[PDB]
Amino acid sequence: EKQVTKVKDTNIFPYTGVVAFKSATGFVVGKNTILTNKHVSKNYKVGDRITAHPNSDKGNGGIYSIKKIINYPGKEDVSVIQVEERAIERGPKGFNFNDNVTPFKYAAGAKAGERIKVIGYPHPYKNKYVLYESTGPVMSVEGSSIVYSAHTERGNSGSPVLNSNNELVGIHFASDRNAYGVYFTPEIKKFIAENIDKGS
């Protein structure tokens, strides 16, 4: 069964793991490091900004500059984004990005029939950067592909796909018939871990 709900407060976990681009979503995976789709990252450049868990104009975890973009070498629609650690506009917990957000942890796996949740910014221009959460069942898990029946829209590109314990099963990339995400295989997890910013 499927449920879609506007999120009231984004400054609580798991919403504190999600970020907004102007046009799409991303989420935090490590030190100064976010994940989005390659079709999102190609529209941005070093110097462009992301906002940590905005709730329209009611408050957020800060504004951060993109300092590096690393596209997954395989065909999977995944991109790693590193941000400058010191915010352009401070969040409530100081200038440090890592003090204002919460990275997501990975689920051990996923299976057909399990309930997942997609959290992101659907039609962010129209909705004014309001977070929505959308739940539904996993239809199949095959290699780097996870298919689920949950409502998604434009703007949801780059949203985390979470299990019931707020752990990552994938990253959303395509709507509609079912929704498609990239399942975190060892090769993709290896790519992400290798490109998490070490810092200075």
XYZ file of C-alpha atoms in Angstrom:
200
model
C 0.000 0.000 0.000
C 1.238 3.565 -0.659
C 1.298 6.749 1.521
C 2.470 10.306 0.753
C 2.812 12.847 3.606
C 4.164 16.469 3.732
C 6.828 16.551 6.455
C 6.000 19.081 9.242
C 9.523 19.474 10.784
C 12.716 18.716 8.864
C 15.181 19.389 11.706
C 14.761 15.919 13.189
C 16.223 12.627 12.039
C 15.810 11.188 9.346
C 15.063 14.475 7.596
C 18.435 15.852 8.799
C 20.117 13.514 6.318
C 18.425 15.149 3.291
C 19.597 18.145 1.254
C 18.097 20.294 -1.487
C 19.620 21.465 -4.742
C 17.657 24.202 -6.551
C 15.931 21.565 -8.694
C 16.374 18.200 -6.947
C 17.323 16.240 -3.844
C 20.406 14.703 -2.280
C 21.403 13.090 0.989
C 24.395 12.905 3.322
C 26.684 9.796 3.288
C 29.764 11.030 5.126
C 32.147 13.831 6.061
C 31.322 16.813 3.756
C 29.798 14.281 1.341
C 26.422 13.963 -0.336
C 24.934 11.631 -2.927
C 22.628 12.646 -5.840
C 21.994 11.393 -9.400
C 24.430 12.015 -12.269
C 21.469 13.640 -14.170
C 21.261 16.137 -11.267
C 25.037 16.758 -10.801
C 25.497 17.530 -14.529
C 23.320 20.693 -13.943
C 25.607 22.007 -11.222
C 29.150 23.147 -10.911
C 31.767 23.680 -8.259
C 30.673 26.902 -6.521
C 26.948 26.136 -6.750
C 25.131 25.670 -3.442
C 23.049 23.087 -1.529
C 20.834 23.673 1.483
C 20.718 21.196 4.378
C 17.115 19.952 5.135
C 15.216 23.178 4.263
C 11.602 23.410 5.376
C 10.443 26.062 2.886
C 11.589 29.391 4.419
C 11.020 28.192 8.064
C 14.642 27.208 8.823
C 17.443 24.875 7.719
C 20.829 23.308 8.506
C 22.767 25.902 6.473
C 23.861 26.679 2.889
C 27.054 25.007 1.635
C 29.132 25.351 -1.527
C 29.841 22.371 -3.751
C 33.627 21.858 -3.836
C 33.837 18.650 -5.899
C 31.652 16.421 -8.101
C 32.592 12.726 -8.663
C 30.446 10.770 -11.092
C 30.129 7.000 -10.702
C 32.188 5.275 -13.481
C 29.541 2.531 -14.065
C 26.239 3.236 -15.935
C 24.328 3.716 -12.600
C 22.858 7.177 -12.065
C 24.929 8.056 -8.933
C 27.174 11.022 -8.196
C 29.181 11.981 -5.135
C 29.160 15.654 -4.150
C 31.621 17.105 -1.683
C 30.811 20.409 -0.021
C 33.082 23.023 1.517
C 32.940 22.144 5.278
C 32.423 25.780 6.362
C 28.864 26.966 5.558
C 28.202 29.997 3.314
C 25.190 30.617 5.624
C 25.364 29.033 9.054
C 23.046 26.354 10.397
C 21.961 26.339 14.080
C 24.926 24.165 15.200
C 27.858 26.303 14.016
C 29.587 26.694 10.630
C 30.577 23.059 10.277
C 28.505 21.043 7.797
C 29.119 17.821 9.764
C 27.713 19.354 12.972
C 24.457 20.323 11.233
C 23.533 17.119 9.373
C 23.221 13.368 10.048
C 24.627 10.848 7.479
C 22.570 7.782 6.665
C 23.769 4.251 7.367
C 23.271 1.361 4.961
C 20.821 -1.429 5.327
C 22.324 -4.956 5.152
C 20.054 -5.653 2.151
C 16.495 -5.356 0.832
C 13.863 -7.853 -0.389
C 10.638 -7.754 -2.447
C 7.632 -6.998 -0.228
C 9.519 -4.812 2.296
C 8.190 -1.263 2.853
C 10.536 1.539 1.838
C 10.294 5.347 2.224
C 11.512 7.962 -0.245
C 12.136 11.361 1.339
C 12.811 14.366 -0.849
C 11.762 17.609 -2.468
C 9.076 17.009 -5.123
C 8.599 19.995 -7.590
C 10.725 22.218 -5.319
C 10.087 25.470 -7.185
C 6.277 25.026 -7.071
C 6.272 23.608 -3.497
C 8.853 26.093 -2.141
C 11.293 23.379 -0.894
C 8.785 21.417 1.284
C 9.913 17.899 2.131
C 7.540 14.957 1.452
C 7.869 11.366 2.464
C 6.469 8.587 0.295
C 6.144 4.922 1.219
C 5.482 1.728 -0.687
C 6.618 -1.842 -1.295
C 9.861 -3.074 -2.902
C 8.883 -4.924 -6.166
C 12.326 -6.464 -6.946
C 16.040 -6.322 -6.102
C 18.398 -7.447 -8.947
C 22.071 -6.435 -8.927
C 22.312 -2.603 -8.760
C 18.586 -2.189 -9.447
C 15.869 -1.748 -6.820
C 12.284 -1.301 -8.041
C 9.543 -0.042 -5.722
C 5.959 1.122 -5.921
C 6.056 4.452 -4.121
C 4.864 7.783 -5.465
C 7.726 9.988 -6.769
C 7.857 13.108 -8.950
C 10.240 15.463 -10.629
C 12.417 16.920 -7.883
C 12.703 13.496 -6.167
C 15.815 12.727 -8.278
C 18.554 11.958 -5.742
C 16.254 11.087 -2.834
C 17.318 8.432 -0.359
C 15.315 5.151 -0.404
C 15.142 3.976 3.226
C 13.970 0.928 5.028
C 11.725 0.993 8.134
C 14.749 1.650 10.392
C 15.879 4.718 8.320
C 18.742 2.768 6.691
C 19.694 3.155 2.968
C 18.526 0.553 0.487
C 19.106 2.828 -2.562
C 18.995 6.202 -4.288
C 15.971 7.163 -6.326
C 16.616 8.108 -10.003
C 13.508 7.413 -12.160
C 9.691 7.772 -11.796
C 7.303 5.457 -13.807
C 4.851 0.910 -14.090
C 7.101 1.422 -11.001
C 9.851 3.699 -9.527
C 13.535 2.811 -9.951
C 16.478 3.344 -7.721
C 20.111 2.317 -7.651
C 20.636 -0.458 -5.087
C 23.865 -0.120 -3.111
C 25.964 -3.067 -4.355
C 29.525 -3.632 -3.025
C 31.021 -1.969 -6.196
C 28.899 1.223 -5.691
C 29.526 1.261 -1.869
C 33.290 0.906 -2.671
C 33.022 3.903 -5.076
C 31.190 5.995 -2.401
C 33.625 5.108 0.467
C 36.650 5.934 -1.777
C 35.247 9.402 -2.573
C 34.051 10.531 0.886
C 36.096 13.644 1.659
C 39.063 12.987 3.952
C 39.052 16.672 5.009
C 42.142 18.752 5.915
